[PDB]
Amino acid sequence: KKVKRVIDSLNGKIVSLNTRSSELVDTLNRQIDDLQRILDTTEQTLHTEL
Amino acid sequence: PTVQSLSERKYSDEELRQDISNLKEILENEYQELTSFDEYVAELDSKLLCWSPPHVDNGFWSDNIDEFKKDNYKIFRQLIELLQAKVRNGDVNAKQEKIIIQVALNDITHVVELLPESIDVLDKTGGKADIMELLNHSDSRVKYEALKATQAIIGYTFK
């Protein structure tokens, strides 16, 4: 808990997994594209407004 | 809104200035002074939601979050059901249904930004899915409001 006060002080973001390196990747790629589509919606609205 | 612009451009005539000011007060006062929960529900009931001065105002939503909670924001879930339904039944992209949607998405956005616990309600109901659908849909105003809804959920999922 003292290494984490070094990491979180100078803005390091620890990624604890504790389940699998193949089950979180699916639930995280199910958010990357789901948020990239919101980028492609709002930036299309931006270029429509401009 | 028209009166508020008019008020700025005063023209030389005492009586004119007087009339414009009196009219600004009456219009503004009469609508806002209704109870907040009441106006929202009256609109909800008719399924005849419209933008009004307190539905684009953040303060209205803050006082009203608590009023919804009756089984995990049951009223909030009512608006989510109502929005989902309009898209799917009576189709999307016809004029009637297009007024209700844009207003509803505006209303939802405000509660979510304010409250982090409403995210659960969107998931259970299936509202989460429905937002994604409005994005593709024609009508610029519906798409703006839809995009703002997506972003409101999104800010909270990842910290």
UniProtKB/Swiss-Prot annotation, chain A:
Coiled coil: 1-50
Source domain of life: Eukaryota
Processing and modification events after translation: Glycosylated.
Note: Present with 1084 molecules/cell in log phase SD medium.
Subunit structure: V-ATPase is a heteromultimeric enzyme composed of a peripheral catalytic V1 complex (components A to H) attached to an integral membrane V0 proton pore complex (components: a, c, c', c'', d, e, f and VOA1).
Function in brief: Subunit of the V0 complex of vacuolar(H+)-ATPase (V-ATPase), a multisubunit enzyme composed of a peripheral complex (V1) that hydrolyzes ATP and a membrane integral complex (V0) that translocates protons. V-ATPase is responsible for acidifying and maintaining the pH of intracellular compartments. Is present only in Golgi- and endosome-residing V-ATPase complexes; enzymes containing this subunit have a 4-fold lower ratio of proton transport to ATP hydrolysis than complexes containing the vacuolar isoform and do not dissociate V1 and V0 in response to glucose depletion.
Assigned protein family: Belongs to the V-ATPase 116 kDa subunit family.
Protein name (database record): V-type proton ATPase subunit a, Golgi isoform
UniProt lineage: Eukaryota, Fungi, Dikarya, Ascomycota, Saccharomycotina
Curated annotation (Swiss-Prot), chain B:
Disulfide bonds: none
Traits of the deletion mutant: Increases the ATPase activity of membrane-detached V-ATPase V1. Abolishes growth at pH 7.5 and in the presence of calcium chloride, abrogates growth at pH 5.0.
Taxonomy, superkingdom: Eukaryota
Compartment list: Vacuole membrane
Family according to the record: Belongs to the V-ATPase H subunit family.
Function: Subunit of the V1 complex of vacuolar(H+)-ATPase (V-ATPase), a multisubunit enzyme composed of a peripheral complex (V1) that hydrolyzes ATP and a membrane integral complex (V0) that translocates protons. V-ATPase is responsible for acidifying and maintaining the pH of intracellular compartments. This subunit is essential for activity, but not assembly, of the enzyme complex. This subunit is also required for silencing the ATPase activity of V-ATPase when V1 is detached from V0.
Misc. remarks from the entry: Present with 22500 molecules/cell in log phase SD medium.
Subunit structure: V-ATPase is a heteromultimeric enzyme composed of a peripheral catalytic V1 complex (components A to H) attached to an integral membrane V0 proton pore complex (components: a, c, c', c'', d, e, f and VOA1). Interacts with YND1.
Protein name in UniProt: V-type proton ATPase subunit H
Organism: Saccharomyces cerevisiae (strain ATCC 204508 / S288c)
Gene: VMA13
Residues of the full protein shown: 320 to 478 of 478
